[model samples]
Target: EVQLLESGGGLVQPGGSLRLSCAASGFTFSSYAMSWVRQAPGKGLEWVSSISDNGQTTTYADSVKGRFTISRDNSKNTLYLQMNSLRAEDTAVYYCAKTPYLFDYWGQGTLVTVSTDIQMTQSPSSLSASVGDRVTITCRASQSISSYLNWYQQKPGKAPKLLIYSASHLQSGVPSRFSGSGSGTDFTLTISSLQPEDFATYYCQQHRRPPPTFGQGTKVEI
Candidate 1:
């Protein structure tokens, strides 16, 4: 499962700069074209900027043309959106997406208050296991997100599939071995028994707020 995560957004005074991060996993960071989009409060979504997969080209939207810089750190497998000269209308939730340019993949989104911040952190970022083994990965919200968390399973050459929703309930048709539990700031997705197909990536996301946020993610490997 390919994953893109955004962070480092929040309140900031006018003229202050905000440098946001979008981390990539389950895929090669530099091998895919990445774009940053934003939704102003109560407004339609807008594509702010984009960088070609090869890191050879870049583009920007008029809204942020002069102040936004889109770049990547191949070694860190992450993308960055640095915004300067912040102002009033700049308050919005920022998102990162990957191409075919219809932008099928997206980050959970990070908010920029212009004058403001938050995150969902997951543990066991990388998990190692074997057949018949049992494993669990945990996620915690920076704020109380209640039980609105969802769990997803992803694989190398496949799309991410939902396993559990609303914290602990299994999605219809998913295997029983994949279960989730917990509330508020804490939750876990447990594999009762590992199957070879289960050796992939797992992610937890909290939907209790306007822009739902995802955990850093956990990888279950052989």
Candidate 2:
């Protein structure tokens, strides 16, 4: 029954600033950590930042830490993302997420348009993999995006889960079955032996320079 409703996202010019908000209910702000995530044009999801349940601690990725701020107001039971001096490439669908317990609880994403960007291409939009089969999904960029590529999995009742970052580094708690490789505009996310639990859609996102892009996603089903 936990829920989150996100708002305050829209078209903004370069250098303009904006604040995105998330009103969360059916859960206490002191019980679950909230994280702000973004999906660029291609649909790649990024783990922007997070505010701890106690509302006293925060974690940010190196890319946007300087301009992106994550905070919470317990009295309003809300979460906020303060984006300062925005960039044209900052356009994305941003979602607020709560962690642990109902682990994937997420808000309906707010689309933030920044007025400029690149298109992404993900191969085999839909694919079927048998249990224990090796499944791989690929994301290609228009130019050399270097090692900023990341992979994620989307599931029912769950927020898009980050599987790999910096193109190859696996995030904590992810299983060994999920792996990533490649760089410079081309990347791949592979599952050595797919599991039934892993039946879901996978996406790739690039997080480098001024513009970030997301792939359309490759859906893997049973």
Candidate 3:
């Protein structure tokens, strides 16, 4: 079974950036695209973007233009996503997602919350100001899939909103940082710079089939 695990707990302040990783075990990472999506504190789903094993990307609605980024490591069968900046609204669960066209599969997900005075690291290695760090997560397919990878957002008691549909076409009103790339077995969803208000949780899903699979949601803590 493939899973996406996130760092649990909360951060202090601005110094604490959010990071999460997903790994594929029961399946092949080079067989489908991975994605990320977001949900407001109490709203429905928010469309984001996805990545392909080939590196082709797509975006959320028109609002998320250039503030997100997603990547994958085929060798390790892992997927990674990072969002900069933080705000009260960016607090929610983000999940690593996959699917042919309809999202159905997903991981338990790791939760990353952003704050002002804290440090969140994915690896156990001590992270220093002089040492840069990078993590990886992955979304595997139980079977083959189409080129369409979809992502969305969901709240505690709201409907899931569509973020990235058909794999790349962003919805209307999304930020620019929320971009997606990749195709086929490899895919990514990225947020260039996390905005203060864009601090909600995110997840990825496949919309090419029935009972779309979804990645566990990642949340922003403070």
Candidate 4:
């Protein structure tokens, strides 16, 4: 079994800096790529950056491209994220994840908050549709993310499951009724005939941009 653990201070003042770490074990440390992700308290997940297991190549979300630096140490089997000029908006739970094919493995998250007055947030917020109705939930981003939208389904207790990726491609085992579409900053996830099981919360994430981020989430209320 593979596992990841995140370590870092929990609080910082505005305009300060912080370094978060992800230590991996139970697997070959240099064999897989590790990506850093985050979730704001009471919000959604965001992909910050990723580093190849070799620690040579990296990709960052456009939003954090200049604000964060991602690096790794093979000797320690760890990855690092250094966030500069922190803000209250930077308060979030940071996680490290490994993906051989997709983001299937993740680290326990580390919550980091910068003491500030302003809170930056974005989302479709909420939505509702009838049982037999065709419904489309939208996610609007604060900045353009090209077309790298992915969709997920989350129930109350169970972990989230991926539904669609790259905006329109359905993941294996996902029903055809679940589909996604859109590009740039606007994206949509459509469900045909909302089933009772499908009444859970839905989220849209953009992987095209570095620092992949999720929409605030849309709950399908009947």
Query: Clash number for every model?
Result: 5, 2, 115, 6
Give the top-scoring candidate (lDDT). 1
- Show where candidate 3 strays beyond 4 Å: 12-16, 58-64, 115-222
Local accuracy of candidate 4 as per-residue lDDT tens digits, 141-212: 666666666677766444456788777888877888987887767777888878778877787766553445
lDDT of 3 at 10: 54
Off by over 4 Å in 4: 15-17, 25-29, 42-45, 61-67, 100-102, 116-124, 128-148, 154-161, 166-200, 207-216
* Prediction 3 TM-score vs. true: 0.47
Q: RMSD (Cα, Å) of candidate 3?
A: 18.5
lDDT of 3 by residue, 81-196 (tens): 66555555556656666643444455554444555111111111211221121212233344444555655544333334456665567756666566655466445555555445
Q: lDDT for every model?
A: 0.78, 0.77, 0.52, 0.74
> How do these models rank on lDDT, best leading?
1, 2, 4, 3
Q: Please give each candidate's TM-score.
A: 0.52, 0.59, 0.47, 0.63
**TM-score between model 1 and native:** 0.52
Model 2 residue 164 distance off true place after TM-score fit, in angstroms: 15
Candidate 2 per-residue lDDT, tens place, 1-222, comes to 667888899988888889999998886776788887776775446667877887888887566878999989988899999998888768888888776212346676888888645556898898987999998777888878788776878874346766787788888789999888996777888899988899887877665643345677787877
Q: Cα lDDT of model 2 overall?
A: 0.77
Lowest lDDT 10-residue stretch of candidate 3: 116-125
RMSD (CA, Å), each prediction:
12.4, 7.7, 18.5, 5.7
